[PDB]
Design a protein around this nucleic acid. Structure first.
Lengths: 305, 83, 73
DNA sequence: GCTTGACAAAAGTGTTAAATTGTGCTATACT
């Protein structure tokens, strides 16, 4: 056909809807084949291959079982589509809703029990709906939210709508936190989670021709004036340290990790110069009050930021 | 300051992963290829706590008892014997 | 496109006699109904059905309400 | 010139409780 769904509906329509008696039939064949498989599989462990006629028929019981599973599914595909119709427009594509529903249908068939004497559509509707709604919670948001959080976001919505109708207005965070039995600060945190992102490719120019995305600054971009001044600062420190003693500057450089970029502990500096960490603590305080001396500090003042 | 380990994916491809030497080398590494891969050194330490997945047979077993399955199969084969 | 404006007047079920009656002085009115190979009111609704809903096999219940639901409804 | 012991803050580790997160499930009949 012309559309994609019109094409899938054509092929699901080519099967025939079962009545109560058939569903029970297929159900038996499915379970019969499964047990036939598990039994023969049990033989693989201990061997004991069956007689020729008993082996050829067991292989058929299984093939017929799978043919049953496939037929029970192909017959109820219409039921999946009938449920997915109502969940569209909520942020999942119709076909995806259908395919997820079919996943639920598959489990309904696996866990279905024919001895309860209930029509198949009764039990499968539960799984197909849960499969679709569970699916929506894992997918429809660009930034995923876990199921338990998607559960509260929805609840908070209904409370607001129900509360909206009774109050003829929208409820405040306190009314909402009260009706839902939560702290008002939580309902705010929840309302921040429910925000959904926007397209950088939107055109907001509105006879501006531009798109949003190109108005976004790059904050991590290199700033020429800073990097240049930072390079000039790096030189001015090199000089100020020249006034200090070979060991005075040596300790300062290892203390802040100027050369390596890796700072060092008072003990570690004492290990290179062969002294106790305290002695290094002392040499520290002295060279710092030397740096604080206005002669050396006056030049670095303009570098505050 | 790095040691390099090699892993092998199930399909035969091999990948070099540079690590820090002081670190403890993992026995499996998610690889650029997209598959798990196994170290070519001694271990290979662990079973990795496997918990076999749930299967259709399991879901059938927890409702029908094995005896019920036998009779239903008896019904099926006997229907097959009639020709 | 590809439609014989006469064929739809058969889709409503009006017989060809009424076509020569109402058309009257129209020359191409009579000449087109003679050119159209559609025979019957329900068969023209089918020639109109498959081009409007391609890919969907029709039914006497769908083919007739197709025209009524599209406009009259 | 530098070291020693006492000492407290700061930084890591290991152990546990609380929380967060994933998954299975719901049987009037409903195509």
């Amino acid at each position: 056909s012309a559309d994609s769904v019109r094409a899938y509906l054509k092929q699901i329509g080519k099967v025939a809807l079962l009545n109560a008696e058939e569903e029970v039939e297929l159900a038996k064949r499915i379970e019969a084949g499964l047990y036939a498989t598990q039994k023969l599989a049990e033989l693989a462990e201990k061997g004991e291959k069956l007689p020729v006629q008993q082996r050829r028929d067991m292989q058929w019981i299984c093939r017929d079982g799978d043919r049953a599973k496939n037929h029970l599914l192909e017959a109820n595909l219409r039921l999946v589509v009938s449920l997915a119709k109502r969940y569209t427009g909520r942020g999942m594509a119709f076909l995806d809703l259908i395919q997820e529903g079919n996943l639920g249908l598959i489990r309904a068939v696996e866990k279905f029990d024919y001895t309860k004497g209930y029509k198949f559509s009764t039990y499968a509707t539960w799984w197909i709906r849960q499969a679709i709604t569970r699916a929506m919670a894992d997918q429809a948001r660009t930034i995923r939210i876990p199921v338990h959080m998607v559960e509260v976001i929805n609840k908070l919505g209904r409370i607001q709508r129900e509360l909206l109708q009774d109050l003829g207005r929208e409820p405040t965070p306190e009314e909402l936190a009260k009706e839902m039995d939560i702290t008002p600060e939580k309902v705010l945190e929840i309302q921040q989670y429910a925000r959904e992102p926007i397209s950088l490719d939107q055109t907001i120019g509105d006879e501006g021709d531009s798109q949003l995305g190109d108005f976004i600054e790059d904050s991590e971009a290199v700033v020429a004036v800073d990097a240049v001044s930072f390079t000039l600062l790096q030189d001015q420190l090199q000089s100020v340290l020249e006034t200090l003693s070979e060991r005075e500057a040596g300790v300062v450089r290892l203390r802040f990790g100027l050369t390596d970029g890796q700072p060092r502990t008072l003990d570690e500096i004492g290990q290179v110069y062969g002294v106790t960490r305290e002695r290094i603590r002392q040499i520290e305080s002295k060279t710092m009050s030397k740096l604080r001396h206005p002669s050396r500090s006056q030049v670095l003042r303009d570098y505050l930021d | 300051p790095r040691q390099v380990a090699r892993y092998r994916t199930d399909n035969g491809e091999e990948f070099d992963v540079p690590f820090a030497d002081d670190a403890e080398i993992p026995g499996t590494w998610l690889c650029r290829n997209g598959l798990e891969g196994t170290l070519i050194e001694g271990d290979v330490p662990e079973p990795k706590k496997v918990k076999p997945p749930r299967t259709h047979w399991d879901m059938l077993l927890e409702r029908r008892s094995v005896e019920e399955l036998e009779e239903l199969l008896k019904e099926r084969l006997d229907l097959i014997k009639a020709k | 496109r590809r439609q014989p404006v006469t064929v739809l007047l058969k889709a409503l079920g009006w017989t060809n006699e009424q076509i020569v009656e109402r058309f009257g002085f129209s020359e191409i009115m009579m000449g087109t109904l003679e050119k159209d190979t559609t025979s019957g009111t329900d068969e023209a609704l089918l020639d109109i059905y498959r081009k409007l809903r391609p890919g969907e096999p029709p039914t006497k219940e769908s083919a007739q309400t197709l025209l009524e639901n599209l406009f009259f409804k």
